[PDB]
């Protein structure tokens, strides 16, 4: 079989920026990859389409996925409110890594972050489940609107998203 590829079309204050495609490691973390895949197609009746990146810290990461509160306090998985840390086989080795945000052990919901640098201090605490396949330049463009405290100067949204393969 093949690992699924999903995409996000990013917009800045409603102006289309571009498309970022991610490869999800379903062969290493099937449950975590499936969650992100289903939230991208919106097939369970809820998902990432229309949500925003509420926290961007230049040189660190872009965080998003809170489609219920749009502020870091919400979101939910396709398995109920939260699910377990599947495994920590993969590490935060550099720019482009896709990983799950959480609030402690076994609290995965829908929030995730895209690393713009190697973040080894998160290894073993956040489940890495994918990587940017194309469009890393769009993620770099996104960083420009972030700040040291995380607040963005423009509203960065996922205008559309779905599965390519």
């Amino acid at each position: 079989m093949v690992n699924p590829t999903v995409f996000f079309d990013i917009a800045v204050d409603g102006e289309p920026l571009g498309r970022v495609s991610f490869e999800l490691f379903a062969d290493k973390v099937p449950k975590t990859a499936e969650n992100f895949r289903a939230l991208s197609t919106g097939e369970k009746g809820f998902g990432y389409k229309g949500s925003c990146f509420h926290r961007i810290i230049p040189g660190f990461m872009c965080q998003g996925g809170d489609f219920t509160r749009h502020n870091g306090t919400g979101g939910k998985s396709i398995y109920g409110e939260k699910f377990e840390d599947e495994n920590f086989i993969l590490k935060h080795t550099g720019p482009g890594i896709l990983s799950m945000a959480n609030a402690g052990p076994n609290t995965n919901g829908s929030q995730f972050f895209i690393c713009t640098a190697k973040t080894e201090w998160l290894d073993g605490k956040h489940v890495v489940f994918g990587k940017v396949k194309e469009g890393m330049n769009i993620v770099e463009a996104m960083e420009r609107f972030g700040s040291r405290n995380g607040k963005t100067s423009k509203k960065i949204t996922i205008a559309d998203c779905g599965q390519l393969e």
Binding site: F60, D66, G72, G75, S99, N102, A103
Partner: peptide, 11 residues
């Protein structure tokens, strides 16, 4: 610091 949490963002 540099953490990625959901709810109580820490230093």
């Amino acid at each position: 610091x540099l953490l990625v949490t959901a709810g109580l963002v820490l230093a």
